[PDB]
Design a protein that fits this description.
part of a larger assembly, 6 chains, A mainly alpha, B mainly beta, C alpha+beta, A: 2 helices, globular, B: mainly beta, three-stranded antiparallel β-sheet, DNA-directed RNA polymerase subunit beta (chain E), DNA-directed RNA polymerase activity (chain C), ADP-ribosylation (chain C), acetylation (chain C)
Chain lengths: 50, 100, 229, 50, 50, 219
């Protein structure tokens, strides 16, 4: 029950959020951004996925 | 104490028979966490009797669940009391209110 | 690369227990890093000096009661646990508490010593309720850090302490709550220089001018490994 | 004597020895399972969330 | 009336406060409910059952 | 023993690869695992200094909204890939490089104008693919030295600057014991860097900076 709540909260998306709309070169850079506080978790972004 | 209760404690803790209750009004004369002696006021003193009422509080004693049931005083030397007031808090009770 | 180093620009001892101290200047983020690292260090590892054992003249076990006292022996021990004192250059000390007469028994009744200082003399230990009532106890105080329960203590002493020595759980840590607030400072006509202000509520045994230095020393020595690679 | 060396013996004995854990009422076979044990200070049995 | 009493104190009329994680100094996203709940130790302690 | 806190001995430094390792510290006093790990993370992830591309000028294009032909990938993709380039710049604050390429084939980081003072740690870094017989590109790439990871908050084109070489650092604490207690912390630190700086020295630097910041109070 708790884990699914965590994943639901993590992968949800919001309309306007901090760090929205930029381009991230990869998932690692995204994570760094979040941990530096420069971006919100629910922010909409374009990341190069492989 | 409970911060949020329903006021029912002021009765449950009294009628439980576990707290020492002042039989008559009077003034406390001596307390030693074991025996509280009350100078029952002459308005309720019997003409020939002593006119001074003891209360031998029960200390650590095993209960049916192997718990301690000691009663501890709450009144102070020289404090006036009226008949029915809780003198010594029993286990799980404090200042006359049930507190689990 | 422009990093500045912090300096304890000011300390305000608002009370005997509550104080504030400002570290300035600090670059970006260092306010958070220092504020939290120092908060954790000060809450956890700060040494203090607390009561460890008690021995009252005519009692045998903590569950008993003394004649002519308003508080049971357990409540006397609980009150003693709250006593906070300083000791000057010793690892342990034995203080005698000799008292009689109707009235309270406060920390002032303890036999004062030149190296022992009580932060709050207005601490009440128990109430005597008889004219001839009297209590004498030999309180033992030890330095240390952290919290040492009596169960761990006696099982680590490895000798049988005599009957009549009661052991209380000591909470050596003398700080109660540490908050840090980061706010900008007008330095060098440039912004983004955080002034970290730490406000601490203690028992009053230690002065922040030494508390923060000891916390910083602890952090630096633990940091020695990561620079030792 | 619970000698401090005895704990090293236990930490060596228990290395790869499964233990069966069996909550009761065990309606279905999934109620009994084997686990690799690890020593814990307390007195409660540490169970996995999943 | 709960709101009125919270207003009497300097406490937030919302009932929920923001907290900070002690390990990392970060602020939890969105405030959390904090208060004084009356808790009781039930007579089922482990040392009587292990 | 009131001033005798335990000092860990590193169990390891499993360099799973030239970029990333699994530096583990053991043992630490309870509550010291996070106190050290989060501080090191907070140093590395946002304050480490390095040189990274911050501004770009591509030939004859005003904005990444414009997708110039001759290149398989678009200008936004070019900018994100150029952001991925790790550089080691010696003794300068900012530099302007020029990359020029021609012919049917990809454009790789080995083609930049090596000044000699500038070291491109990954010559094999692919930039883009040229899609014409006459396909030729030339661009002026600005490098600057700074600290941390500066976002896009600020014919030039801005790009996010990854000054800090640490691509990722994550740490865990776990139970470790001595002969009499199991309340102690073992700190497993993992970091992956861009490769300009080896991780094992990167953490050495991080601790360096922090210790320096602690200098005024410790005796």
């Amino acid at each position: 029950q708790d884990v699914v709540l965590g994943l639901y909260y993590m992968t949800r998306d919001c309309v306007n959020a901090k760090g929205e709309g930029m381009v991230l070169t990869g998932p690692k850079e995204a994570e760094r951004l979040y941990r530096s506080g420069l971006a919100s978790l629910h922010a909409r972004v374009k990341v190069r996925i492989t | 104490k409970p911060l949020v209760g329903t006021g029912m404690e002021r009765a449950v803790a009294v009628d439980s028979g576990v707290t020492a209750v002042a039989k008559r009004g009077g003034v406390v004369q001596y307390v030693d966490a074991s025996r509280i002696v009350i100078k029952v006021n002459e308005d309720e003193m019997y003409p020939g009797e002593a006119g001074i009422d003891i209360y031998n509080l029960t200390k650590y004693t095993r209960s049916n669940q192997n718990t301690c049931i000691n009663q501890m005083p709450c009144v102070s030397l020289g404090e006036p009391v009226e008949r029915g007031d809780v003198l010594a808090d029993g286990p799980s009770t404090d200042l006359g209110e049930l507190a689990l | 690369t422009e990093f500045l180093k912090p300096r304890l620009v000011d300390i305000e001892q608002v009370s005997s227990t509550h104080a504030k101290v400002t570290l300035e200047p600090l670059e970006r983020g260092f306010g958070h890093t220092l504020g939290n690292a120092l908060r954790r260090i000060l809450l956890s590892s700060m040494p203090g000096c607390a009561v460890t054992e008690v021995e009252i003249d005519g009692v045998l076990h903590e569950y008993s009661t003394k004649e002519g006292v308003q508080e049971d022996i357990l409540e006397i021990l609980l009150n003693l646990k709250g006593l906070a004192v300083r000791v000057q250059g010793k690892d342990e000390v034995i203080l005698t508490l000799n008292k009689s007469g109707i009235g309270p028994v406060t920390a002032a009744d303890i036999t004062h010593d030149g190296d022992v200082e009580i932060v709050k003399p207005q601490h009440v230990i128990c109430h005597l309720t008889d004219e001839n009532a009297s209590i004498s106890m030999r309180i033992k105080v030890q330095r240390g850090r952290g919290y040492v329960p009596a169960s761990t203590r006696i099982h680590s002493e490895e000798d049988e302490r005599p009957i009549g020595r009661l052991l209380v759980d000591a909470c050596y840590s003398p700080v109660e709550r540490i908050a840090y607030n980061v706010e900008a400072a007008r330095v060098e006509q440039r912004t983004d220089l955080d002034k970290l202000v730490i406000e601490m509520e203690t028992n009053g045994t230690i002065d922040p001018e030494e508390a923060i230095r000891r916390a910083a020393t602890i952090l630096a020595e633990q940091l020695e490994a990561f620079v030792d690679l | 004597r619970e000698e401090a060396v005895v704990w090293d013996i236990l930490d060596e004995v228990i290395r790869e020895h499964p233990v069966l854990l069996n909550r009761a009422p065990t309606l279905h076979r999934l109620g009994i399972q084997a686990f690799e044990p690890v020593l814990i200070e307390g007195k409660a049995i540490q169970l996995h969330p999943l | 009336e709960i709101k009125e009493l919270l207003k009497l104190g300097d406490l937030p009329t919302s009932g929920q406060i923001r907290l900070y994680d002690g390990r990392t100094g970060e602020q939890f996203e969105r405030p959390v409910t904090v208060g004084y709940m009356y808790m009781l130790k039930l007579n089922h302690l482990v040392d009587d059952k292990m």
